[model samples]
Target chain A: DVLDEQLAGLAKAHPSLTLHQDPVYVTRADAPVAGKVALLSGGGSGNEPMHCGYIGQGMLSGACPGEIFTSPTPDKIFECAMQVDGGEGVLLIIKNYTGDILNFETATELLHDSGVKVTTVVIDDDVAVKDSLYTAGRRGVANTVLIEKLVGAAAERGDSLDACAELGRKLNNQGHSIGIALGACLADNEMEFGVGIHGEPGIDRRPFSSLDQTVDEMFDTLLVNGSYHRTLRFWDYQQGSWQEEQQTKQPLQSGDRVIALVNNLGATPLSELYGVYNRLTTRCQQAGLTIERNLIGAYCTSLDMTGFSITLLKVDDETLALWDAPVHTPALNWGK
Target chain B: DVLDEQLAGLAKAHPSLTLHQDPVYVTRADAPVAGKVALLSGGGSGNEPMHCGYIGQGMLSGACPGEIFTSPTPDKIFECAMQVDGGEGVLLIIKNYTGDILNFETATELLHDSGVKVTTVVIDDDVAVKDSLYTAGRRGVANTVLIEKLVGAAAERGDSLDACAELGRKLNNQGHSIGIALGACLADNEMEFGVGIHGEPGIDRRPFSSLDQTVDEMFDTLLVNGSYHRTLRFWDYQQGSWQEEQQTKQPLQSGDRVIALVNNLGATPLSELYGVYNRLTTRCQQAGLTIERNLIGAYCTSLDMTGFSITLLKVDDETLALWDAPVHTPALNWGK
Candidate 1:
């Protein structure tokens, strides 16, 4: 009842954004932007604005949100894909969760069977999960928001589905994220790092320290001897399933230009975010990584948690241009 | 110590913003936009983005923050006015507080004596306190955020100093705001309607109830039998002091067009905000008002207090265009 009331409220207030009743998907009132590939992304509802808050021109065509911290069914994704497809095709930008992967894969088949061209890119850039032995795989976290913005811009520029999908994969490889929590539900005196967006226990709990030391330790996790390695997965459209790909995390270095994101887990104050950004940029500079641009705020959050995460995406000129592209979504809007 | 640490962190993270240590002020790195009328606004420190966050092109040229919930000194304001003067003139956007009115007035004299052309506009739109009985006037609240944006955009469009100052007064006259609190420090089951931003007790302490009831009561107060009236203040630059002006809070009619703002006081979840927006818009429609545009977020806040405010501004084509103009600042940014 609460989500429905809130969702309806959002629908009425933002006339530019429309909501589909049966099942559920929020999309631009003027969607499928004519000659461009439609980009669709969604996940559980608790991650406010991550998927839904980003529905607008130069961003997502549609977002399917399931119950709080619960993945949407394949039917919703399939139907949402059909509604936003502007003939160029639709690209599914999915996070790498077991439920998300399964449902999105099922929807991909439904779209293909319906004679629609579709491709999928799985985001697994959260470096907190070093091995898939613990969870389904290295879980997709805040980097998904960055990936959506970049890929959305590409699709807006009339890039083909293949090219857009390729760009998504390339970005996934270039990005790495690590988070540290100060405490739970607005904790100011304890510590919880390596936490997931859901109400899962963090990898550890320790005494609270200064943000300078907190950020320093988190930044170190993203690099190892100036280089990093991992194995990621991609949606193989031909096989209609996910396939493993051996990928190495690009170690951040002095000459490397990167777009850094300092995201709030939800209830952290803006002043504190500036604090995080303050120390974060310093750590990047100390490590020899060129901070091209930075975004600091609550983009992807775990509902009322008092923690933060750092995401760095190695970027080139093209990526920087896309990051600056016009966006007018509910949560993220600028450059128009 | 916490505020200093946070402020220090902000300075290092953002290169485009610089701090004037002596007398304490924050200004755009490139101040004095050659031939434009510079804008200056400030108040207590707790309102994070209000004065400081709104400093950049198309917003405040400089911001002077006093101690937490404390008015800035005349010396700080005088120095800030001098630092941001663009050779054309400088306009001080002061809130309708006793401290702000006196200090900014004193600083305006310092600037005028130094041969710097200056004028000011005072904001006092909070409808909560009808008669300024126990408080300092109606205690300027969140509507200040809207005035800064509209006035900032006017200055960007090359409006003269007189025109810009008049626009600020005009916006202050046109807007009205009221807020209700759900809890404090994450207490989700209590109510504090008419709470002040500085932890002041609300007009009443009510029992825990639904957001539906909270919004309904708040919305009812915005409408009256046929007209709304209040006596506000304005800075008469000619007299170099304050003067009273009787203004009517225009009643909503069938064909009236307005801009609605649903603002979070501090820690209300984004989803909850959407819920509020949903009910607020419906109330406006039933009352025969058409909301042309709306802004829903935490533009004004009290640290960690869970509350929400609703503000509506009567708008026309010119005002809408200015509102649409580009602004690049820390807290609120768009269009460039």
Candidate 2:
């Protein structure tokens, strides 16, 4: 249990994060994990040791955490790395947000890459990022956890460094995630469509309704990955590719191809994953498409954000199994 | 989604228990199977089709559902039997509680007199009854899920009526569980202990604190029985009978035994379970005690009850194995 006194001392040293003690002090990552793969990420404070708390296991032999609406500093990240590394190496996985990316990069330079190693992967999979003005790229939301979970399991299984790196790359390449807020954002009623994990307001906001329709629109969009804009970012599609776009977010062309992700950004109860699945599958069937694999859980958050996202990766079976292997940890733990 | 129309129909049929609903509907039960050990059980309306939703192949053959807070009626149980009964006959697995036991007994009697072959096992694994004021017996809680999971799997594997019935009994006999109301009862600000599955008031309500402290106290209570309870419950330790007091609740003056169980009435998440585990296991080692076989997770739950109870059964290996067997169900999916 983390006590006030201990937290106070730590806060004095690292004044960037906030602590909410109403639910007791169960801190997942007190220090960072480095060496192997430096997978660092965090979000809202209430999701338990999800981001920071689950740092030691999975891909993030260590992690960097943010408070309610903030990101961690370089010193905190380096300190966490010092504790987590076993002299193997590090791969710094970051969400493709301008702020989070910049902050993490600063930490990387400050660390000076000495005898140790640090690699970075910028994740931007949200399909709606084409419309957002504030996003660093696609908001790095829940898919970060997917990267942590899959790569972490692979690294734990002693996969080769290239394989582990591919694991992250494949996750970014094969996976695409999106979500919709259930109601209005400001009134806590926003039904965010293509919502990112960072609680970034979605592009197609609308009234709360059955998730079936919401699932259809999202999954249909995934089949052919036309560039939502002129900039083509890598992501999962049910059928097409981002290279298919000609002009505006035009109707998907023949070359467009893809995979799908259904994620709860944050704040949804644990059991709601099944509800999301029902809608996603129903949509996939209606569109006459089959999703290779689907993961349902809150991977990111908007600081206790009450929404979810869907991510899909255009990958084959073995890689998905890597994602499906058992991972023992404080935050994510399961296999099917 | 289970609209108001469906609920109104049920309310008209069973008015004795509570009624609550959302737009979400659950998996529907379809064709009943023959040549299989049919299993079925359920609780109040809000818990979904626990007894009904899970009624399918590899799960319950039949189910009995209750109102939101109350148990099902004899008629519903009887109807469910008619709906789910297959040529191999059916076994009614019930929790040890006034409402459930009574309803199950009523159904069994109704079936037997009608020339239907049926048997029943009552689960009374909760240890919190020692604290209940209005209760003459401990309300069966989370252990019900474990029974459904393990025994359900056994039945799914074609265990005989006698074998399934025996397995259920063996699981009940071998398992021990315990919990406490760490705060106010169901109040966002409160914690509870020894509550029922339907969110009943617990034994002692108090303020919430660090999970570590709560875990330590829980473990302190579990170590007393350790392996001693295992031998006794299975009669493996019947070196001699107690001519006097044979139970360890008061510490056998001459001949006595002990078993351990920690129960989460319901609504106690896994995160909390880990802490309780951390504390109880830690305390046991410090106390020089040994648990031959242990089972955690919700063995019994109050309907959304906020607390837990511990039960320890002094039993042998045969009983323990019954618990170790695999189980499959919606409520609790586990394996040996």
Candidate 3:
């Protein structure tokens, strides 16, 4: 009820936003041309502007939100796909969490069975947790924001569902994120070096002192190579279930060109985010990584957690151009 | 140095944004038509995306940020005005605070003496403090963001300096704001009411409690009317100095249509802000105030302060149209 109430408030404010009840979802009141592919993304609520705030002409066509930090039901996701269908295929963008993957997969099968073309792309960009080590693979962090924006633009440009899905997969593989918590929830003396977005205590904790020191350690971890391997899932539409596939993550190197993102993980002040960006750019240069572009603001957040995350998405010309494309959403807006 | 570094980072990110050196200020890399009036506003720097982030094609032409919570010097303000001024002259938008007013007043005289026909409008919209009763008058809080955006759009639409300045003054008089702190800065068990942006405690301190009770108290205080009378300052370029005039703030009446802003005072989460806005809209409707438009996000802020402020500006058709006009800036952006 609180989420619905909040959604209603946002819908009232933005003339472009509209809410659908029953199986709750939000759509850009007007968008998605009849012959153009539709882009959809969603997850647990609390990450405001993530899936919902991102619905508009050049971003997501629709977003389905679950209860806070929980996956939305399969029916809700299917309803969202049905709501945004424009006779063109639907592409589902999902994070790498087990819950999200399973749910979005089910939605994909449902849409396919209904004779609507469907494709899915899963993003897992958090470098903090090794996929073989964490039970849910490397948890998707702030990179989902990047994936959604780039793929949205590609879709808007009349790219087929297959092409947009491939673009999302490429961007996800190129992006790496690691978060450092000076104080996780409220104010804590100890620091968390690799905290998850859902209040998961980090792998390592140490006595906190200053931001530069925390950043220095985070930089070391972010750039270093760790053995990463996992078995990911894909939807088996014919069998009506999921199938597994093996994957491996590559480490970022010195000569890589990147689009850096210094994201606020809830309550970190914007001024301090600037302070962090300054250090981040300097550190990137020192490490011999070329900083091509950057996004510095609150994108992905752990509710009220006083921390920050850094995402360096390795990019070539094509990926860079996609990242630069126009998007109009409540959270992220650019170009046209 | 920190400001310069941050400005450099911003400039690197947005091609449309540029940083002016010497007496530092940030502005649109390309804007300010030679015959169109330019809007300028700035203050202490902790409020990211406030003055600086507001600079762009359809918003502020230039913004001069001082050290954190400290007003910029007269020279810096003067430099900014001269730098951004086109043949049509410049309009300075100032907030009501002792230091900011004095410094901006000095800059206005300097600009006038330099043959740059300059006019000024002062915004004092915080209902939390009474000017005649309180020592420093009403502290200008979140309403500055609204004032700048509205006036910026008017200027962009080729409105004369006099007309834009008048609109700003009218909007300033119509806007009313009040803030509540669940906890200001760090971790505080108790709550604060009417806390100033620079961490000036508040009118009252209460026991820590739930959000609904806090919202109820805030709602009552936000809507209540007290006699508002004060002598406000404006620059009279004809006299080459300052002049004082009496003004009164009007309280919202039943059936009045308003543009309500639920502003995040820094560290509050977006979902929480939505929760606040949900209750805010409901309360306004119950009181017979028609919520014609609304902005709910982190526009103006006190660094990392866990609080929010509600600003309601009485508006007519023209005002709503101006509010909806295109503007491109970092924090507040739309219709580009």
Could you tell me which residue pairs clash in candidate 3? none
Give, for candidate 2 chain A, the lowest lDDT window spanning 10 residues.
A234-243
Interface RMSD computed for candidate 2 is what?
Answer: 10.8
lDDT by residue (B1-336, candidate 3, tens digit) is: 666666676776677877777867777776445878989888888887787888886789998898988888888889888888887889999888788888998899889989998999888877775542222788888888888989999999999888998899889888888888877663366778877787776777876576656676776776674347888878776777778889887788787888888888888878877777778777888989888877888888888888888888889999889988988887776775
Local lDDT at B43 for model 2: 48
- As a whole number from 0 to 100, the lDDT of residue A59 in candidate 3 is 80
Give candidate 2's total backbone clashes: 109
CAPRI quality of model 3? medium
Worst 10 residues of 3 chain A by lDDT: A128-137
What's the TM for chain B in candidate 2?
0.66
What DockQ does candidate 2 score? 0.08
Q: Judge candidate 3 at residue B27 and give its lDDT.
A: 73
Per-residue CA lDDT of model 3 for A1-336, tens digit only, reads 667767777776777977888878888787545878898888888776677888886789988889988878899889888878888788888887778877888789878889877877777877776542323778888988888888888888889877887687767777888887776552467878788887776667877776666777777787683336667666544465566767666777789898888889889887777767777778888988888888888888877888899888888888778877888787887776
Cα deviation in Å at residue A16, candidate 2? 31
- Share of real interface contacts recovered by each model? 0.61, 0.00, 0.51
Winner of 2 and 3 under TM-score: 3
